[PDB]
Ligand binder design. Sequence first.
Ligand SMILES: *[C@H](C)[C@H]1/C(=C/c2[nH]c(/C=C3N=C(/C=C4\NC(=O)C(CC)=C4C)C(C)=C\3CCC(=O)O)c(CCC(=O)O)c2C)NC(=O)[C@@H]1C
Ligand SMILES: *[C@H](C)[C@H]1/C(=C/c2[nH]c(/C=C3N=C(/C=C4\NC(=O)C(CC)=C4C)C(C)=C\3CCC(=O)O)c(CCC(=O)O)c2C)NC(=O)[C@@H]1C
Ligand SMILES: *[C@H](C)[C@H]1/C(=C/c2[nH]c(/C=C3N=C(/C=C4\NC(=O)C(CC)=C4C)C(C)=C\3CCC(=O)O)c(CCC(=O)O)c2C)NC(=O)[C@@H]1C
Ligand SMILES: *[C@H](C)[C@H]1/C(=C/c2[nH]c(/C=C3N=C(/C=C4\NC(=O)C(CC)=C4C)C(C)=C\3CCC(=O)O)c(CCC(=O)O)c2C)NC(=O)[C@@H]1C
Ligand SMILES: *[C@H](C)[C@H]1/C(=C/c2[nH]c(/C=C3N=C(/C=C4\NC(=O)C(CC)=C4C)C(C)=C\3CCC(=O)O)c(CCC(=O)O)c2C)NC(=O)[C@@H]1C
Ligand SMILES: *[C@H](C)[C@H]1/C(=C/c2[nH]c(/C=C3N=C(/C=C4\NC(=O)C(CC)=C4C)C(C)=C\3CCC(=O)O)c(CCC(=O)O)c2C)NC(=O)[C@@H]1C
Ligand SMILES: *[C@H](C)[C@H]1/C(=C/c2[nH]c(/C=C3N=C(/C=C4\NC(=O)C(CC)=C4C)C(C)=C\3CCC(=O)O)c(CCC(=O)O)c2C)NC(=O)[C@@H]1C
Ligand SMILES: *[C@H](C)[C@H]1/C(=C/c2[nH]c(/C=C3N=C(/C=C4\NC(=O)C(CC)=C4C)C(C)=C\3CCC(=O)O)c(CCC(=O)O)c2C)NC(=O)[C@@H]1C
Ligand SMILES: *[C@H](C)[C@H]1/C(=C/c2[nH]c(/C=C3N=C(/C=C4\NC(=O)C(CC)=C4C)C(C)=C\3CCC(=O)O)c(CCC(=O)O)c2C)NC(=O)[C@@H]1C
Ligand SMILES: CCC1=C(C)/C(=C/C2=NC(=C\c3[nH]c(/C=C4\NC(=O)[C@H](C)[C@H]4CC)c(C)c3CCC(=O)O)/C(CCC(=O)O)=C2C)NC1=O
Lengths: 160, 68, 48, 48, 160, 160, 161, 161, 161, 161, 161, 161
Amino acid sequence: SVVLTTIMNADQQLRYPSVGELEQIKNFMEDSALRLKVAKTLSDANDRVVKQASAGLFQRRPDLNNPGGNAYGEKRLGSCIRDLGWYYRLITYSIVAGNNEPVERIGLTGIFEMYRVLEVPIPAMIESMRLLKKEALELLSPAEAEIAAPYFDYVIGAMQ
Amino acid sequence: SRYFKVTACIPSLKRVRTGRELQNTFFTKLVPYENWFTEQQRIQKAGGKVLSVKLFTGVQGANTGVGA
Amino acid sequence: PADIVRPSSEDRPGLTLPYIYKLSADSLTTFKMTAIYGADGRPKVNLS
Amino acid sequence: SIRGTSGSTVARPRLFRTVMTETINGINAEDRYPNSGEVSQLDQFFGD
Amino acid sequence: SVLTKAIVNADAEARYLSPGELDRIKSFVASGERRLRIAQTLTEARERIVKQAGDQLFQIRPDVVSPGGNAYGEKMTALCLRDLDYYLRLVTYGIVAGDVTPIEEIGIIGVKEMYNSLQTPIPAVAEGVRAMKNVATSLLSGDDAAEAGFYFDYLVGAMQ
Amino acid sequence: SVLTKAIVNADAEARYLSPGELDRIKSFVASGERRLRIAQTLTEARERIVKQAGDQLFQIRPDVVSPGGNAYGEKMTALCLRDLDYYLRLVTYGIVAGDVTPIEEIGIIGVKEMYNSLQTPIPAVAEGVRAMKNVATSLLSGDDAAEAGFYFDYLVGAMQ
Amino acid sequence: MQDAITAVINNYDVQGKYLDGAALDKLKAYFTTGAVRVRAAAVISSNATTIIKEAAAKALIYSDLTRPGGNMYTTRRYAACIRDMDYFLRYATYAMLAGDPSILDERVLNGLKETYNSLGVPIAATVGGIQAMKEVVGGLVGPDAAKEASIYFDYLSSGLS
Amino acid sequence: MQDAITAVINNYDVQGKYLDGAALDKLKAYFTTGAVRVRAAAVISSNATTIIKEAAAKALIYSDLTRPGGNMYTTRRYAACIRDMDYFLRYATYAMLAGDPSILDERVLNGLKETYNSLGVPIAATVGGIQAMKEVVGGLVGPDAAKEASIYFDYLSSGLS
Amino acid sequence: MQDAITAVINNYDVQGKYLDGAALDKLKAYFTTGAVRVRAAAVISSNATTIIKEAAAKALIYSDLTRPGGNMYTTRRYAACIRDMDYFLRYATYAMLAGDPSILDERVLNGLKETYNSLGVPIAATVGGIQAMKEVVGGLVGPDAAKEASIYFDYLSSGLS
Amino acid sequence: MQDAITAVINNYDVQGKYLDGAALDKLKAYFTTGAVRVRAAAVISSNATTIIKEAAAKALIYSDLTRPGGNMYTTRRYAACIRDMDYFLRYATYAMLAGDPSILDERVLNGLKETYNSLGVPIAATVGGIQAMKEVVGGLVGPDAAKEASIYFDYLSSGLS
Amino acid sequence: MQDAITAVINNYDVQGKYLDGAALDKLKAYFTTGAVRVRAAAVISSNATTIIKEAAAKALIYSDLTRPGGNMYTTRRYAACIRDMDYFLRYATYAMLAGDPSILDERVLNGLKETYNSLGVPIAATVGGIQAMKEVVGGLVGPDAAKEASIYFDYLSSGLS
Amino acid sequence: MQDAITAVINNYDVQGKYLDGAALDKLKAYFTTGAVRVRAAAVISSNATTIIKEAAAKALIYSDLTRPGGNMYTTRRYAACIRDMDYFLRYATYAMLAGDPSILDERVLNGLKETYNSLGVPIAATVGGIQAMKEVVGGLVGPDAAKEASIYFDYLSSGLS
Ligand SMILES: *[C@H](C)[C@H]1/C(=C/c2[nH]c(/C=C3N=C(/C=C4\NC(=O)C(CC)=C4C)C(C)=C\3CCC(=O)O)c(CCC(=O)O)c2C)NC(=O)[C@@H]1C
Ligand SMILES: *[C@H](C)[C@H]1/C(=C/c2[nH]c(/C=C3N=C(/C=C4\NC(=O)C(CC)=C4C)C(C)=C\3CCC(=O)O)c(CCC(=O)O)c2C)NC(=O)[C@@H]1C
Ligand SMILES: *[C@H](C)[C@H]1/C(=C/c2[nH]c(/C=C3N=C(/C=C4\NC(=O)C(CC)=C4C)C(C)=C\3CCC(=O)O)c(CCC(=O)O)c2C)NC(=O)[C@@H]1C
Ligand SMILES: *[C@H](C)[C@H]1/C(=C/c2[nH]c(/C=C3N=C(/C=C4\NC(=O)C(CC)=C4C)C(C)=C\3CCC(=O)O)c(CCC(=O)O)c2C)NC(=O)[C@@H]1C
Ligand SMILES: *[C@H](C)[C@H]1/C(=C/c2[nH]c(/C=C3N=C(/C=C4\NC(=O)C(CC)=C4C)C(C)=C\3CCC(=O)O)c(CCC(=O)O)c2C)NC(=O)[C@@H]1C
Ligand SMILES: *[C@H](C)[C@H]1/C(=C/c2[nH]c(/C=C3N=C(/C=C4\NC(=O)C(CC)=C4C)C(C)=C\3CCC(=O)O)c(CCC(=O)O)c2C)NC(=O)[C@@H]1C
Ligand SMILES: *[C@H](C)[C@H]1/C(=C/c2[nH]c(/C=C3N=C(/C=C4\NC(=O)C(CC)=C4C)C(C)=C\3CCC(=O)O)c(CCC(=O)O)c2C)NC(=O)[C@@H]1C
Ligand SMILES: *[C@H](C)[C@H]1/C(=C/c2[nH]c(/C=C3N=C(/C=C4\NC(=O)C(CC)=C4C)C(C)=C\3CCC(=O)O)c(CCC(=O)O)c2C)NC(=O)[C@@H]1C
Ligand SMILES: *[C@H](C)[C@H]1/C(=C/c2[nH]c(/C=C3N=C(/C=C4\NC(=O)C(CC)=C4C)C(C)=C\3CCC(=O)O)c(CCC(=O)O)c2C)NC(=O)[C@@H]1C
Ligand SMILES: CCC1=C(C)/C(=C/C2=NC(=C\c3[nH]c(/C=C4\NC(=O)[C@H](C)[C@H]4CC)c(C)c3CCC(=O)O)/C(CCC(=O)O)=C2C)NC1=O
């Protein structure tokens, strides 16, 4: 969260929060009333956005559901869709949070190391998160799209 | 002049270091009084916990003999 | 296996190194001491 | 642009290891001369 | 400034600007017009604020303007008023910057050593800054008064 | 010994055993039979080599068998012969061990403090070791005597 | 460590549930009051030294603790105790801002009780100083954040005792 | 490192003057150009990797730099590129978020010529690579925000050469 | 630590005895199996990642450990568990080549049970993963060194449990 | 650093060539002389202190260097001179083992002449000592490796002088 | 400056000693190789421009040094680099004739490195050119003076590096 | 020194490119403002002495500078100070004409700080005089070239201070 990030710097430098830091801590809460329904709409699509994203990514990269593919089979497809649901949940947790904290601390710091022994294509995950970012804004208005696009940009900016 | 004898564990949760990280995740070492505060703060900042602290070296009276 | 990220502070930039670049180096001889066991002790000890 | 310089150097980056450089660098890191068991390594390496 | 504190913070981790940082930068650029207007309003009334604050300070702490006082004499009083004007200028710089970064480097680090060398009462200087805060808040609307006063309390706390 | 140093170096390097590093292991397991034969050929004459090194040492250093020396007296002369037998046992240990590590850890670290507290000539002990080397080289074959002299001269350099 | 938002996030992530009505209610309950937390934190930061002064004056100093023989004898021990006082106040302010005592449980209480026992520090005197700080802070901040600061002050005092 | 806001304050502080009309005009201009910068920063992000790949194909690859002898002949020399780059992005995305050269002179472009001279690394090639990314980012970002990104990229290339 | 040769040499050094018939037979018994240990170590080194993948798939994956509330949940903990798996495999290879679990006691098992208890790691799950690695290694190495490999994995499992 | 094999392989890589007959014949020449260098290095390592022994006794001591006003006067300077002389012997051993002077140039020769000029060390005396150990090493190693050892000592002496 | 004979004469004059057997042996060692140095110096003096041309062709030209952005680009910088190359060749000839690098220390290397750092010249490329002249001169002179010529080029390269 | 046109030509030549649309737009950007710069330069040249007189009257004279103990005391120092003012004005005019502060960096500010510190000249007073001259020049030239004139005076002041 924003408060967690600010208190981290303050405790690291051994000092109280700053005069420009409380201005940001207060501005993080005043838009919380608007942002609460923003993730709520994305929250109430959770088993639909990823379901329609499966056909959007597996049709694009057809080698993920082929004999030489990592997601070959019904139960192997299920794991990929469950991963998409996990990342959607984490990105919603971050959009109801502020800074990168919920995604980066839980399911972002070491995805390369997880896949190091797991064999799941990072360049395919890039297009998966791109698709998720593209299929989740349309439920929102452009006013909410401005408050949604950067929050989705971080996944495909970090894994890269 | 006195060294606290303590034991503690400190997990690194942001880098996943990949070589000989077992001697750096649980230790007992004599630490001086003048450096004990800054050393003990590091464990709490990293996220580990101190298991025990023992004064060892000196007496709790202090006064003369504190300097070193 | 990722890029070795060297984290920096607020005064200087943080850096990144390709893993293969340091994989073709002289491979970093290091010295480590194994002696926390118990100090007062119990384990295998010996002088190592 | 550029108001100060620390100068350049002649750097020799490493491209690959190939056992001989690794053994010599491991010996140099301790600064001790080749070991008795280290001696036979060069022997069978030159024999190969 | 907030831009300095945000960009360099996302440079110590070797990443682009976080989606959590593609915010309050935005709030700062939104409130930039208000900050500039407040700074201009304070700058226009710099002489009145300094004069009245020095008046209040010399009534509250008459010992400094006594024979055994650090600021005894017409030119010693002129130097005290010049220091008050300096701190008003630093406060305007902080207001425009949106952070106390510039005023910290310009007139806070080492101020204890400087004033101890000159043998000046730091609590007296703090009370002078408080008087300047009161006079400045008397000339502004409530929101802008709070916005400038918060930096004023930063100066008061730092000189301590 | 050889295995210990190889594994220690590899673990300090934070990698598996190098293909070159295993080569010393293969060479050791190849030459183990020959080194065991040489070890038994040395052990079959422990008292005879100590004897002949005794004549060589006493004839080369009447200092040690002088009234001011430490060998004056049959008791301390017997003690010196026991020390020579100790060092022959140490060198045969090193010969079987392939690395000088047992020799280093038994009899050269603190040997200076040893013989200084005992008030004994380090050069005299080195001369005795060299005479032992000469007798052993006469007792073995030249090719294996090269490695045996390598161990003996490492000991001679260590006690110096 | 955690605040209200992070506590809700990981407390839901442990069983993998999306943010529901109760979760959004908890988040709204946090966001509706944190501005008073911001004002209280600013006031506390501006008046930190005075708070430690009055807490020491009404709870520690003028006593046998500061007399020869107490723990607060010698300027070294005096400075150490006042530094501890400052640390307690700052971590209490952090806990009040965060709306969660995990910060106190990690960076405050961890390795402090047995350390005070080994050093001979008076736990009762430390608790009294903590309550003096809480009284002064409640006097300064006002009704808006008085209970918010007092709950975490009581958390620290109960953790010490 | 300095932005426009800090640069104006630093320039007006050494001569000890309050912020006058000219300073308020410069700050006003930056504040008015404060949204396209933020949008183009996010656009440069996400599409960063494809930008680097396209720039590499356009300038670096398909030349002597890939044949035997070049400074990108093998991989790990190729890998030092994409790296080397990702800087010149990253930085100058910082520049067109806190717009001033400053950062580009203090962190990236300072002794880089000395390091390249000591390591080989054709400076003309690495400047052509910079201009390729300038073209690709001008294409991706938009009509109006193509400029000032072109400004910072041109500053980087000119300073390096 | 000590190998077979170092252990026998130290055991004879403590008594101050020249190498005798029994020590010679022990040395010959170690020497006769020298080559097979080298071949097994080469095979495990060449196939190391595949052993970890198969052991993970057969022991820890597709369970509650990977789900929320599990120790191996989150990419940090998953990478930590697989890195520990690699640690166990590499040090088992070390012990098998050295012919002694002294290094296993010195550099692996020392404080490992207590640190896993402090961190909350499933010791039974780690034992199951170690046994999966033992099965995979015994399958790949063949009859020649299967039980030599498996004895040290059993040593690690018994030290953990 | 580099040796014969690494120098040859990089020299053909920089061109982009397969290792042809001339390169294989140079590796022929290096490999056929291998065991002689190994035994020479073993002899040097075993007799290192005595080589310095006779070298100092024949070139440095019993002169104006050790008397007051000399450079090697006082125990500190004597120990430093012998440590330097050992440094030269060990690095000559490394160069002889590698079959290349790159290590000597990289880690000994650079900064050496400038440091000795800074501290007032007699370079002529140092060259004399190096020639002393060259003669002693030629006496010890014998016909097999005498020239191969002496070439690197001559290289060091020529680089210093 | 000083040659071998003047160096020996100064080393004996500083001690105030008449010439002895060692000094006579050193002078005789220089005398026995006098003619080969003269022949080699005549060869380089006759073929001066061809050596520079081949060295530039082998190490410098047809690269990024002679292209835009290179340090050798433009006629002025090309002339400067060739004149520096000629200086190095001539002083190498002087040093080879005199049998002592003291002239190279006094008149070339002193401050050359810091001048090149100020001017931005690539020291690595300069070292490459110096070595290229080294092999060209070694090919021209023949086995008789190849090593004697090569030692001073190596001295210049090590001094620059 | 370099101007707008030569700067564009050089920064295209060092990268070896031809004149593209960006450089062309830069050059017409300079060309469009040619008349304003020359008119302002003519006005400044015609009013050179009056500007210095008014700036000195506003910032330097009638103070402690011209009294004994001031640096501007004595006819020699007064003449030198007004000569320095003429220096700054003329070089600012050249920089305004050329549209580039490179002439200011090369021929005004290089070593000026250390020279003034050696001579004891008041740098703050010099910067105040430069700003007074800037104010007078901005008054004379008018809004047309006031900003372009002011940027180079500000560059001089920032370099000095
Ligand atoms: C994997 C099969 C299981 C598992 C493991 C797990 N381990 C950690 C953290 C650590 N593991 C180590 C290990 C070692 N230190 C040593 O010195 C050696 C031998 C040389 C070993 C094997 C240590 C010290 C740590 C702590 C420091 C660190 O994190 O690097 C974690 C992370 C715990 C946390 O989040 O703090 C995990 C998850 N988890 C499973 O589910 C498996 C049963
Ligand atoms: C007198 C010349 C100056 C002065 C002093 C002053 N002191 C106090 C209060 C205290 N002074 C101490 C002192 C010490 N504690 C130690 O351990 C030592 C070392 C032996 C010393 C010197 C302490 C502990 C106190 C606190 C009260 C207590 O003792 O319990 C005051 C009172 C301040 C107040 O706010 O009440 C004063 C005034 N004042 C002057 O003007 C002189 C310069
Ligand atoms: C003050 C109200 C009371 C008091 C205190 C006292 N403390 C010490 C010494 C230490 N106190 C700490 C404290 C902390 N470590 C932490 O991590 C935290 C929270 C982040 C705290 C509060 C530590 C580590 C030390 C020892 C190291 C050091 O002081 O640098 C002393 C000194 C004891 C001595 O003389 O040996 C004292 C006196 N004393 C009182 O009278 C009060 C009741
Ligand atoms: C790529 C388009 C070109 C190229 C480059 C190349 N670079 C290196 C090595 C390094 N490059 C850097 C660069 C930086 N460090 C910094 O801090 C910054 C600014 C923040 C920069 C730009 C450094 C320091 C190195 C050395 C250490 C490292 O690798 O990180 C190489 C490798 C050279 C080698 O093999 O030793 C290469 C190849 N090569 C090309 O062909 C392009 C023209
Ligand atoms: C889907 C777009 C891609 C894909 C995925 C895929 N994943 C798995 C298996 C697992 N994925 C995870 C992931 C996580 N654990 C975490 O803690 C987090 C952070 C929140 C993540 C993302 C895990 C743990 C597994 C293992 C099973 C388990 O969860 O227990 C598979 C199956 C691999 C297999 O060997 O069976 C697949 C296929 N595959 C594609 O092709 C897409 C690019
Ligand atoms: C005499 C009581 C003991 C003894 C001595 C002995 N010394 C040498 C040779 C040298 N001694 C020195 C000493 C020093 N150099 C210094 O700078 C200092 C500090 C002031 C000292 C003490 C040196 C330099 C030499 C070498 C010769 C020289 O000076 O040029 C010898 C000769 C050894 C030999 O020839 O091999 C001896 C015998 N011998 C005894 O028995 C006494 C116990
Ligand atoms: C001995 C035969 C001659 C001699 C030498 C002498 N050297 C020093 C001091 C130093 N020598 C070194 C050398 C090295 N460091 C390295 O890393 C290497 C290559 C790997 C070398 C060759 C250094 C760095 C020093 C300075 C630091 C130190 O002393 O360790 C001294 C001491 C000078 C002094 O007193 O300050 C001496 C005397 N002197 C002679 O007369 C001989 C000809
Ligand atoms: C040529 C192989 C390399 C190269 C060289 C280069 N040098 C210069 C300029 C100068 N070189 C010198 C040299 C010397 N001064 C001395 O006293 C000696 C010892 C006899 C030498 C060798 C000097 C003084 C200059 C400066 C000349 C001046 O003032 O203009 C340049 C020109 C740099 C410029 O900016 O014009 C160049 C290019 N460049 C390469 O690429 C080669 C590796
Ligand atoms: C008087 C007989 C004539 C006259 C003089 C006049 N002078 C000024 C102003 C200044 N005169 C000086 C002089 C000096 N500075 C020095 O260091 C020395 C050497 C000792 C001298 C002589 C200076 C510095 C000034 C400037 C003002 C100042 O002193 O601060 C004026 C005023 C002009 C104006 O424009 O204000 C006048 C009138 N005028 C006559 O008609 C007489 C013939
Ligand atoms: C010695 C080890 C090694 C290799 C092999 C290597 C390869 C290598 N292949 C490249 C490109 C390329 N390589 C290929 C194609 C192929 N590549 C293959 O190994 C196949 C035979 C074939 C496809 C069937 C193509 C098409 C490109 C152009 C880049 C692109 O694909 O967009 C590049 C990028 C620069 C360039 O375009 O030349 C490198 C560095 N570098 C190394 O260090």
